[PDB]
Each structure stands twice: as structure tokens, then as C-alpha cells.
């Protein structure tokens, strides 16, 4: 069985830069290696076959090479249309194997999040539950710490985060953090706050509200 | 006009059976190989099975042998993946692809297969009310299975919208929020409606978001 060990699992690069993804096979696969591009929500598209041949429509900035067991895909200058996940593949013989993928994300300057907090809707409380939503909108880099405080007590094990894919225009991220409680548990406190720390903020930003105001 | 269109996915009980199909256009399936490749949510591509419709020969990944069967019918220019003894681990998007040998030179857009004993359930949609840019949205809460779609003002509102990827709750139901920012001078006059669609449960909701 052939293993295909692809590296790195993710990378950030600016537009115009050179990016290098490598795939290391466990044994000789001769030149029977392909590379694929997958954009979020879409089918993969073939970019390279037999280590170094460019497929239909693939611009001259993608290139592939082999040295024994190592396979490399290079983009000479990252263009915005090149943000995607990349996969190596051996078609030497079955079982067929793909590498784990490489997510290429573009580099950008630091942008602090704008923070918004949303108390639970009155219709949700009538249903029996309460969701408090903290929104961090349009920031970079993706790393960011969101911390919930209720009655100024740090919370744990009751909030879930979701992050958008990098945006195509401004190339930033947005994040939601959602605290969900039963209606009884929600009315047992007064003040709900989310504190946000991020590279772009000189000090952590807190958004809070008092449950009955 | 080369096309590959998968169908037959959906929500299926564990231990059950499902038959996927892949209709091909713009080429004869007996001129190439056909491949089934799956992608579990948030994970990489994993080969499932391949067939030469011309020779009828087949090959399979270890983890599906015996319980999956790939076949093809050249007179329908269509291939199939009969999946049996389904497990939670088989939940994934299943792509059909063509190419010589095991190269895959064209891929369809795939079909979502969800293997779960949980029942379908439509979301409840709650406003995220705004409080000079303002943020507002809707919480699309407690649905199963994936996917839902969210638009704003029937697709007329597109700039500044963020629809977050869904997250599994501890209860086994999904939830997500969709937000939009807009300068605040509009908050009393412009109407903001989020249109939510959950095809698996035949649920359609349009919720007005007011401050």
C-alpha cells in the first residue's frame, strides 16, 4: 500500500509570492502522480498529471516536479484565484491514495475585529432556550480569543465558535461565538459579556448587556 | 459539454442501503474509467471504488469491499455505487469522476450521504436584532441533516453577508447564524428579511429582522 505524505497542512502567503507544496510517497510511484485543486464547496479539478504535465486550462504559473519519491507543486506568484486546498494523488496502482491536502490562504495586514453581541430573541425564550451570540466581523489573522463572562464569571464548556472561509474581496475572517442555555439557566444571571482579544486590538474589547434592560 | 451528475444521496439509517448513480454526458463511459471518491465533512479525499465500464472490471478500497458494489450500464451511460451495511463513518460527499487508469480528469459536484438514526427536523429561525454601521442576522437553530441555505431579501442583499458554517450541537442537531452589516441610517425604513430553506424537511422560513 502506498502512503502519500503531503506537507505542510496549511500555509499563508501574499499575492505575488512563491509557494511550494511537496508530497512524499512511501515507495516508488514512478511518475504516476497527479495534483488537484479544490475550492470550498466545489469539486476538485485536475491541475497536473505525471508529476510535471499541466492539464487543460491550467495557467503557466503552476508547475510540478519529481525527484525520486518526492513530488512538488509550485505556484510562481500566488494570485487571488489560487486560494484553495491542494491534493497530491498516486495513480500508480490500487489502493489509490491522496495526500492529506494543503490549504493555501493568502496573507494580509492585521485587522482588528468589530465586535457585536446579540441577546436571545423573545421568540426563542418562549421556546425554552436562550442563545447569546458574539460576532467578530472582518478581522485578520484568524487567531482570536473569545471569552464569555456571566455576572463577571469566566465560563467554560458552553460556547461554540464558527469561522467563515477567507473572503474573496478583503480576504478577512469573521467569527461567531454562541452561548446557548436553557431559559431557566439564562434568567439565573443578569449580565452576559464576551471579551475579545486579537492582534489588532491594543486591549481586549468587551461587549456586554444586562438581561433585563 | 462533458458532465457527470450524481444522484441518490440523502439521509439513511445506519446498517441500511443506498444506491448512488452518476449520469455522464459529452463522452461515452466505456471510453474511460469511472471513480467514486468521498470526502467526509472537514476532511480529505478518500478513494472508494473504480470501474472500467468497457471491461466491467472493478476495484475497491479495503474498508468498503464486500458491502459496496460499483457497476455500470453502458446503454444508460451511467454508473452506480450500491452501498450496504452503512455506517456513520460513511457519511460524506460522494463524487463521481472519470479519467484514464486511476487519473481523475473530470469530477462531478458530488452527492451528500448522511448515515444517522436521527430524524429529520426543520430549523427554527430567530432574529438577531441590531443595536455608522449596524450588524443584524438570524439564528437558524436545531435542524438535521445538513444542508440549509440562507439568503437575504430574496438574494437582493448580498454585500456584507456572512453565513457561518453550521456546527453540530451536543444534541445532535445543527445550528448556524447568518449576519449582515449595514449602515445604521436604514434601520427603521429598509426591511431586512432572511430567507431560510431546509430542503430535507420541506421547511421554508422568511423572518423579518427588526430592531
Amino acid at each position: 500500500d502506498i502512503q502519500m505524505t503531503q506537507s505542510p497542512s496549511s500555509l499563508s502567503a501574499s499575492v505575488g509570492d512563491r509557494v511550494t507544496i511537496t508530497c512524499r510517497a512511501s515507495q516508488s510511484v514512478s511518475s504516476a502522480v497527479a495534483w488537484y485543486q479544490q475550492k470550498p464547496g466545489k469539486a476538485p479539478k485536475l491541475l497536473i498529471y505525471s508529476a510535471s504535465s499541466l492539464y487543460s486550462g491550467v495557467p503557466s504559473r503552476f508547475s510540478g516536479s519529481r525527484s525520486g519519491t518526492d513530488f512538488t507543486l509550485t505556484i510562481s506568484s500566488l494570485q487571488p484565484e489560487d486560494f484553495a486546498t491542494y491534493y497530491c494523488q498516486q495513480y500508480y496502482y490500487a489502493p489509490i491514495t491522496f495526500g492529506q491536502g494543503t490549504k493555501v490562504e493568502i496573507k494580509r495586514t492585521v485587522a482588528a475585529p468589530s465586535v457585536f453581541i446579540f441577546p436571545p430573541s423573545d421568540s426563542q425564550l418562549k421556546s425554552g432556550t436562550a442563545s447569546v451570540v458574539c460576532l467578530l466581523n472582518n478581522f485578520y489573522p484568524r487567531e482570536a480569543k473569545v471569552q464569555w463572562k456571566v455576572d463577571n464569571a469566566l465560563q467554560s464548556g458552553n460556547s461554540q465558535e464558527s469561522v467563515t472561509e477567507q473572503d474573496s474581496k478583503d480576504s478577512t475572517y469573521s467569527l461567531s461565538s454562541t452561548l446557548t442555555l436553557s431559559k431557566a439557566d439564562y434568567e439565573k444571571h443578569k449580565v452576559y459579556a464576551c471579551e475579545v482579544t486579537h492582534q489588532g486590538l491594543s486591549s481586549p474589547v468587551t461587549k456586554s448587556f444586562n438581561r433585563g434592560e | 459539454e462533458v458532465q457527470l451528475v450524481e444522484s441518490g444521496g440523502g439521509l439513511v439509517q445506519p446498517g441500511g442501503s443506498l444506491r448512488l448513480s452518476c449520469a455522464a454526458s459529452g463522452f461515452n463511459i466505456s471510453s474511460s474509467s469511472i471513480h467514486w471518491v468521498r470526502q467526509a465533512p472537514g476532511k480529505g479525499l478518500e478513494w472508494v471504488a473504480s470501474i472500467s465500464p468497457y471491461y466491467s472490471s472493478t476495484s475497491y478500497a479495503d474498508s468498503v469491499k464486500g458491502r459496496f458494489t460499483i457497476s455500470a450500464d453502458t446503454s444508460k451511460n451511467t454508473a452506480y455505487l450500491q452501498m450496504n451495511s452503512l455506517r456513520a463513518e460513511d457519511t460524506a460527499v460522494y463524487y463521481c469522476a472519470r479519467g484514464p487508469g486511476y487519473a481523475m480528469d473530470y469530477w462531478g459536484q458530488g452527492t451528500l450521504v448522511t448515515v444517522s438514526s436521527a430524524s429529520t427536523k426543520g430549523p427554527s429561525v430567530f432574529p438577531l436584532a441590531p443595536s455608522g454601521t449596524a450588524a443584524l442576522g438570524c439564528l437558524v437553530k436545531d435542524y438535521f441533516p445538513e444542508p440549509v441555505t440562507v439568503s437575504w431579501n430574496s438574494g437582493a442583499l448580498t454585500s456584507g453577508v456572512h453565513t457561518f458554517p453550521a456546527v453540530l450541537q451536543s444534541s445532535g442537531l445543527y445550528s448556524l447564524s447568518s449576519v449582515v452589516t449595514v449602515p445604521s441610517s436604514s434601520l427603521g425604513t429598509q426591511t431586512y428579511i432572511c430567507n431560510v430553506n431546509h430542503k430535507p424537511s420541506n421547511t421554508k422560513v422568511d423572518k423579518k429582522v427588526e430592531p
Binding site: 505525471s50 504535465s53 492539464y55 | 471510453s31 468497457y54 471491461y55 472490471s57 472493478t58 484514464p100 487508469g101
Partner: peptide, 20 residues
């Protein structure tokens, strides 16, 4: 036309697709 196409034969077909 089968699964067991040699790597050179796979090359040839994709090469001929690229040309056309």
C-alpha cells in the same frame, strides 16, 4: 480502456485531451 492502463498510456490520453 481498462483500470490497468500503464502510466505511459495514461500520459498519452491526457496529453491528447490537452491537445484537443
Amino acid at each position: 480502456r481498462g483500470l490497468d492502463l500503464s502510466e505511459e498510456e495514461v500520459k498519452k490520453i491526457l496529453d491528447e485531451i490537452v491537445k484537443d
